[PDB]
């Protein structure tokens, strides 16, 4: 079928170009509409605009002289440019597929019918923040465990969110469970991953967290052990 | 008038005096824009041509079955020829002392629920040869019309005097929609025919039908208490050597009745929806190079 | 855009109304939002769902009009606690750009789970690298709401502590974190660390020392 996948700066400064790509897969681009919709902390869904078949424009009015919705059909992709953002910017965009409907209620002849449109399959998000601080990475730490344990890996003092946290490269995934971030006062994201595992493996086998945090272009990995 | 729009007619306020006779409200109205001009501000547009009197919404406009009885001592001829045409000597005469039952349907272009005839349809005129002399064609088997006004409108009574309420209209409840007619394509096209056919008993050539040269230009009639204009081209556009077709009707609520001394009327808005079945059973016609 | 509150009991049915009535003939879209996830197209036309929806989730069309429109959820579950939005088209209304104001659906009457706490001394390398941090961790919680209290051996701490809001998780139960910042030389200079974690009417206490 059709699914999609976001990608983007996740920061950007303000009063600048917020650029963005979205890549579908298992669909053509040429017979489909496509909305972009943002979501803020505390604000609800916000539909930003859509770009047609027929490769038309029509933007939400809320957002004035800003939003260029573009497209290139040599892939599935489609980009997205928001520029002079600022701090109320920051938000999770989602990609979608919109499609038409046609709601006649008198005549079709007269002019009597209105065009919908509704969302049947989303993307997953990017998360967009706009400030004036620099990007930071990470730095983990281990967490070394006590008939079952628990250990896993601290991820200390990066910016901005997120961080994905993998076990043995994605070999380990039952009892994982990363836990939601703290923002501390310092302005840095904090994470903390743990594993809940048998006690009869603990000696020995080998276990490995894969942290990523991409506007750091930073890729570690570190051991746990007693 | 303070008018505004809807997306057709407008959405007009202003200030009238009430019952009491220094007091002042500022209501709001819809008029049709044939019913207003342009002074925006707007007008109602009569107060530069006349005096218009509400018309009073009990009385009904149907039209009702009027005999026409001669006095004692006087008759009434009839003709029972089913081809008569207009004038000459009827080999079929009985005398009544009243007429049938009559309509007074007011009508234009188009003759509706009226008499039909028998045998085949005929056509009457003066001296047909001439051009300014109006063509009465009769038919014999009805062409079944529907008209329609989908706007859900409603009422508003307004004291504008101790005992003088005038009726307006405001707010259309769900879809805006547009007043129209529908006849059938088919029996439309039957009939047209059956009228072509007699338009070579009196000339030879082709017979084409064309649009007139908006009382008169369109299909003006009464459907349950509003008078409707339906654009009759859809309707005359046809050269002869399922489907509905659909007439637009615009809806005026002012009309200069028939003279234009200085008295019009204000037909008060009906409430709900409209719709109503006739037949045509006549037409007007009027003939202007090889054609 | 603002938050309606909903509450319904656990297999009941649920019926949200739509925050803007229709003026003429209607199209109306209803969206499951979970806070910071993706939308779920429950409805697009009046009443039509797409394929991979329970039949428990239905719309109300428009055949004459007056009837508003509502989103009727029967035989609701836990994890039916979303946000839910209308998106209203109408004949009269322009362009419906903007969603649905919000109706948050909140499920009353679940299974009360107790939190398990699980703190972990500093690390290795961060006290090598001069700093310490005391993690204790909460998961699998209902309701979700604790309170967090911190004791440096025996006297409380507030001091140098962070705490997440509690957020859901794939079972429906709540999980929040609980950093505690001390310096490496505090770290050593006390006999024990406390984590106390009440929630609800009773506290779990999870201890560890320096060695
Ligand atoms: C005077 O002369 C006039 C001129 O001749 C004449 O005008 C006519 O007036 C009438 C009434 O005023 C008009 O009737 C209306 O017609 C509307 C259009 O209906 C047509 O289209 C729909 C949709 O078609 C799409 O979907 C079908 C399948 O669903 C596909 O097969 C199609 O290919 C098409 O999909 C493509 O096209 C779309 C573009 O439209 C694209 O977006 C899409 O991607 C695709 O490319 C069809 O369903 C209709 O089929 C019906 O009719 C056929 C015969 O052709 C029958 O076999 C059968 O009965 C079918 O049901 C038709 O083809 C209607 O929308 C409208 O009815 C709705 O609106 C009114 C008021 O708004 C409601 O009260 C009513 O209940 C209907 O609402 C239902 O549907 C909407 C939208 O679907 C829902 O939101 C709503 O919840 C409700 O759903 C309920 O009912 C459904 C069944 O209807 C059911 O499925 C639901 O589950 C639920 O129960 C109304 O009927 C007519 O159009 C005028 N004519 C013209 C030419 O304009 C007038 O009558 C004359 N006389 C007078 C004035 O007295
Ligand atoms: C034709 O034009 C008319 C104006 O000349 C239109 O009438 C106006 O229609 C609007 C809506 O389109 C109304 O505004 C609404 O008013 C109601 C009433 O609430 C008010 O009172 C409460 C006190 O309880 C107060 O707290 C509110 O703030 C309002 O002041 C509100 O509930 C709505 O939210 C909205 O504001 C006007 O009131 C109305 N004016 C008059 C004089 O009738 C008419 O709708 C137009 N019609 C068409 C077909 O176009
Ligand atoms: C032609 O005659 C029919 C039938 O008398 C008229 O339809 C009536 O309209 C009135 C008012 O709209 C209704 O109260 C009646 O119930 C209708 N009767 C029927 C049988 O439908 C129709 O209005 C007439 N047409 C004209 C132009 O006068
Ligand atoms: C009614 O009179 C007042 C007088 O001040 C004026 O301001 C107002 O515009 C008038 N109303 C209309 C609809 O013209
Ligand atoms: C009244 O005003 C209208 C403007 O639409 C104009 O056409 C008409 O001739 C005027 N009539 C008189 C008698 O002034
Ligand atoms: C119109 O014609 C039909 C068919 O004969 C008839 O039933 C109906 O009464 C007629 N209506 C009028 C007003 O003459
Ligand atoms: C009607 O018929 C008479 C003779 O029957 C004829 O003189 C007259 O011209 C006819 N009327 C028309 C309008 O043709
Ligand atoms: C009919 O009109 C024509 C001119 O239009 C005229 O020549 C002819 O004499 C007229 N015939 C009658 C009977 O009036
Ligand atoms: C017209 O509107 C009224 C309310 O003003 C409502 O009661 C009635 O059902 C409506 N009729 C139609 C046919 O929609
Ligand atoms: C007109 O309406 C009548 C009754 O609603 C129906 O029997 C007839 O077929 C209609 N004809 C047309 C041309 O719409
Ligand atoms: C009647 O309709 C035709 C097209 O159907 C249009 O060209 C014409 O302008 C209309 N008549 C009037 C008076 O507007
Ligand atoms: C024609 O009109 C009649 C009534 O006006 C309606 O019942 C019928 O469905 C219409 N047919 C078409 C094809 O529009």
């Known amino acids: 079928q059709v699914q999609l996948q976001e990608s983007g700066p996740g920061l950007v400064k303000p009063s600048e170009t917020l650029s963005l790509t979205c890549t579908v897969s298992?669909?053509?681009?040429?017979?489909?509409?496509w909305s972009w919709i943002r979501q803020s902390p505390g604000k609800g869904l916000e539909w930003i605009g859509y770009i047609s078949d027929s490769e038309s424009t029509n933007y939400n009015p809320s957002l004035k002289s800003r939003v260029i919705i573009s497209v290139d059909t040599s892939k599935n992709q489609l980009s997205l440019k928001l520029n002079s953002v600022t701090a109320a910017d920051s938000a999770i965009y989602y990609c979608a597929r919109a499609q038409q409907g046609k709601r006649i209620y008198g005549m079709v002849s007269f002019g009597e019918f209105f065009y919908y449109y509704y969302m049947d399959v989303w993307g997953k998000g990017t998360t967009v923040t706009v400030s004036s601080a620099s990007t930071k990475g990470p730095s983990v730490f281990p967490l070394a465990p006590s008939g079952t344990a628990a250990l896993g890996c601290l991820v200390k003092d990066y910016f901005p969110e997120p961080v994905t946290v993998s076990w043995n490269s994605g070999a380990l995934t039952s009892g994982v469970h990363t836990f939601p971030a703290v923002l501390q006062s310092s302005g840095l994201y904090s994470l903390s991953s743990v594993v809940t595992v048998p006690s009869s493996s603990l000696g020995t086998q080998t276990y490995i967290c894969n942290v990523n945090h991409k506007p750091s272009n930073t890729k570690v990995d570190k051991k746990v052990e007693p | 008038l303070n008018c505004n729009n809807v997306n057709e007619m407008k959405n007009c306020s202003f200030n009238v005096t009430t019952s009491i006779r220094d007091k002042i409200k500022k209501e709001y109205a819809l008029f049709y824009k044939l019913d207003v001009v342009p002074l925006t501000n707007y007008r109602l547009i009569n107060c530069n041509t006349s005096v218009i009197t509400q018309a009073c919404p009990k009385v009904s406009f149907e039209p009702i079955p009027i005999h026409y009885c001669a006095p004692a001592g006087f008759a009434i001829l009839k003709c029972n020829s089913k081809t008569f045409n207009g004038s000459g000597p009827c080999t079929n005469v009985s005398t009544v002392q009243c007429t049938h039952g009559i309509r007074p349907v007011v009508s234009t272009q188009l003759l509706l629920n009226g008499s039909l005839a028998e045998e085949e349809i005929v056509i009457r005129s003066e001296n047909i040869t001439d051009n300014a002399k109006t063509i009465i064609v009769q038919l014999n088997e009805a062409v079944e019309i529907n008209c329609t006004r989908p706007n859900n409108n409603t009422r508003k009574s307004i004291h504008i005097g101790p005992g003088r309420a005038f009726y307006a209209t405001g707010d259309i409840i769900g879809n805006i929609r547009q007043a129209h007619c529908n006849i059938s394509k088919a029996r439309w096209n039957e009939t047209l025919g059956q009228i072509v056919a007699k338009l070579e008993e009196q000339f030879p050539k082709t017979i084409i039908f064309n649009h007139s040269s908006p009382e008169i230009v369109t299909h003006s009639f009464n459907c349950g208490g509003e008078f409707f204009y339906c654009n009759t081209t859809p309707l005359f556009n046809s050269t002869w050597n399922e489907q509905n077709i659909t007439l637009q009707c615009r809806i005026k609520q002012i009309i200069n009745m028939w003279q234009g001394v200085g008295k019009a009327m204000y037909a008060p808005p009906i409430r709900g929806q409209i719709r109503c079945s006739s037949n045509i059973t006549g037409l007007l016609l009027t003939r202007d190079n090889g054609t | 855009s603002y938050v309606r509150p909903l509450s319904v009991a656990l297999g009941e049915t649920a019926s949200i109304s739509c925050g803007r009535q229709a003026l003429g003939s209607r199209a109306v879209q209803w969206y499951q939002h979970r806070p910071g996830q993706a939308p779920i197209l429950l409805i697009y036309n009046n009443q039509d769902r797409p394929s991979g929806i329970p039949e428990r989730f239905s719309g109300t069309p428009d055949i004459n009009f007056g009837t508003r429109a509502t989103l009727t959820i029967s035989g609701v579950e836990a994890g039916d606690e979303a946000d839910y939005y209308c998106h209203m088209w109408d004949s009269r209304s322009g362009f419906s750009w903007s969603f649905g104001g919000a109706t948050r659906l909140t499920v009353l009457g679940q299974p009360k789970a107790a939190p398990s706490v699980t703190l972990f001394p500093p690390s290795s390398e961060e006290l090598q690298a001069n700093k310490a941090t005391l993690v204790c961790l909460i998961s699998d919680f209902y309701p979700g709401a604790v309170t967090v209290a911190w004791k440096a051996d025996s006297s409380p701490v507030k001091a140098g502590v962070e705490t997440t809001t509690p957020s859901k998780q794939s079972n429906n139960k709540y999980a929040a974190s609980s950093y505690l910042s001390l310096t490496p030389m505090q770290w050593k200079m006390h006999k024990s660390y406390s984590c106390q974690v009440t929630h609800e009417g009773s506290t779990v206490e999870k201890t560890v020392a320096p060695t």
């Open positions: 298992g669909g053509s681009i040429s017979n489909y509409y």
